[PDB]
Amino acid sequence: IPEPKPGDLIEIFRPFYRHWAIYVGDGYVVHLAPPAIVKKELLYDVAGSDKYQVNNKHDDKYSPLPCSKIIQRAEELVGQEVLYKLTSENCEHFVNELRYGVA
């Protein structure tokens, strides 16, 4: 897999779970983690042995926001709590809000 662009959605294929993250560069992604807390961590470390892919699933319906706006919002949330639990669907929702906005 070539290096993703900043703002790209990353789908991580666990056994029995789909963890999502958004690429913010230099090997880093922003994603949710159990204490949910927003973390900025290296994709190699997050994925471990699991496969992953870029999956900008909704680029056919919505334009991504400007890359600098995606990154600013992702960075503003790093270290902050979110009010829902980790599920595959909640994780995907989280990164979709970053790439596409609240709509």
Author numbering: 5 to 39, 58 to 125
What do the authors of the reporting publication say about this deposited model?
The small GTPase RAS proteins operate as “molecular switches” that fluctuate between inactive and active states. These switches can be activated by the exchange of guanosine triphosphate (GTP) for guanosine diphosphate (GDP), which is promoted by guanine nucleotide exchange factors (GEFs). Here, we found direct interaction and inhibition between KRAS G12V and novel H-REV107 peptide.
Several studies have shown that H-REV107 is ubiquitously expressed in most normal tissues, however, expression is lost in human tumor cell lines and tumor samples. In contrast, induction of H-REV107 expression resulted in growth inhibition of RAS-transformed cells in vitro and in vivo. Characterizing the molecular details describing how H-REV107 binds KRAS G12V is essential to understanding the molecular mechanism through which H-REV107 inhibits oncogenic KRAS mutants. We obtained the fraction crystal of the N-terminal domain (residues 1–125), but the electron density for residues 1–4 and 40–56 was poor. The crystal belonged to the orthorhombic P212121, with unit cell parameters a = 42.935 Å, b = 52.997 Å, c = 62.796 Å, and α = β = γ = 90 o. The structure of H-REV107 comprises four α-helices (α1–α4) and six β-strands (β1–β6). The H-REV107 peptide was synthesized in a water-soluble form and its fraction was designed from α1 to β5 (amino acids 65–74).
